[PDB]
Amino acid sequence: KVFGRCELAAAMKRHGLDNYRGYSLGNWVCAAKFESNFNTQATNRNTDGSTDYGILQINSRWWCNDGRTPGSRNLCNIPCSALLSSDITASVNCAKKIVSDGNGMNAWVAWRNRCKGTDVQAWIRGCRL
Ligand SMILES: [Cl-]
Ligand SMILES: [Cl-]
Ligand SMILES: [Cl-]
Numbered sequence: 001k002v003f004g005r006c007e008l009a010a011a012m013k014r015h016g017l018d019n020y021r022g023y024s025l026g027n028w029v030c031a032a033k034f035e036s037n038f039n040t041q042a043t044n045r046n047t048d049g050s051t052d053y054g055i056l057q058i059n060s061r062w063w064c065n066d067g068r069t070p071g072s073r074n075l076c077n078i079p080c081s082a083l084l085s086s087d088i089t090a091s092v093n094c095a096k097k098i099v100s101d102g103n104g105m106n107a108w109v110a111w112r113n114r115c116k117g118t119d120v121q122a123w124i125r126g127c128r129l
């Protein structure tokens with residue numbers, strides 16, 4: 001599923017991500033925009049052989065099991081496939097563990113490089129929320 005901007009904002013809110021660990025909804029929308037262009041089915045191989053999965057590009061190195069990332073962890077206790085679903089529940093539950101891990105949203109390198117410090121409220125502007 002390719003989400004629309006306000007549509008994703010509303011799903012993120014429904015799943016309790018808005019201001020989770022202090023990060024406003026526009027931060028989450030911005031991270032999703034630049035991680036996956038809002039496409040739940042996005043996947044991207046890393047040079048180290050891990051893979052990033054879903055709307056928030058969650059990495060098999062730590063967070064999910066794909067069976068092909070030697071020595072990796074599965075801290076969200078889920079198959080990486082569960083992160084590609086049209087329903088964002090698994091992605092949201094895992095992102096909550098990620099953003100609690102110590103470095104906040106800096107875990108998402110595109111959030112750090114493209115969202116952090118910017119006018120993130122633009123991302124939810126005009127949305128019936
Ligand atoms: Cl957009
Ligand atoms: Cl915001
Ligand atoms: Cl593995």
Ligand SMILES: [Cl-]
Nearest residue numbers: 066067068069
């Ligand atoms: Cl493979």
Ligand SMILES: [Cl-]
Nearest residue numbers: 072073074075
């Ligand atoms: Cl584990």
Ligand SMILES: [Cl-]
Nearest residue numbers: 065078079080
């Ligand atoms: Cl699994």
Ligand SMILES: [Cl-]
Nearest residue numbers: 011086087088
């Ligand atoms: Cl959803």
Ligand SMILES: [Cl-]
Nearest residue numbers: 022103104105
């Ligand atoms: Cl923080």
Ligand code: NA
Nearest residue numbers: 060064072073
């Ligand atoms: Na893993």
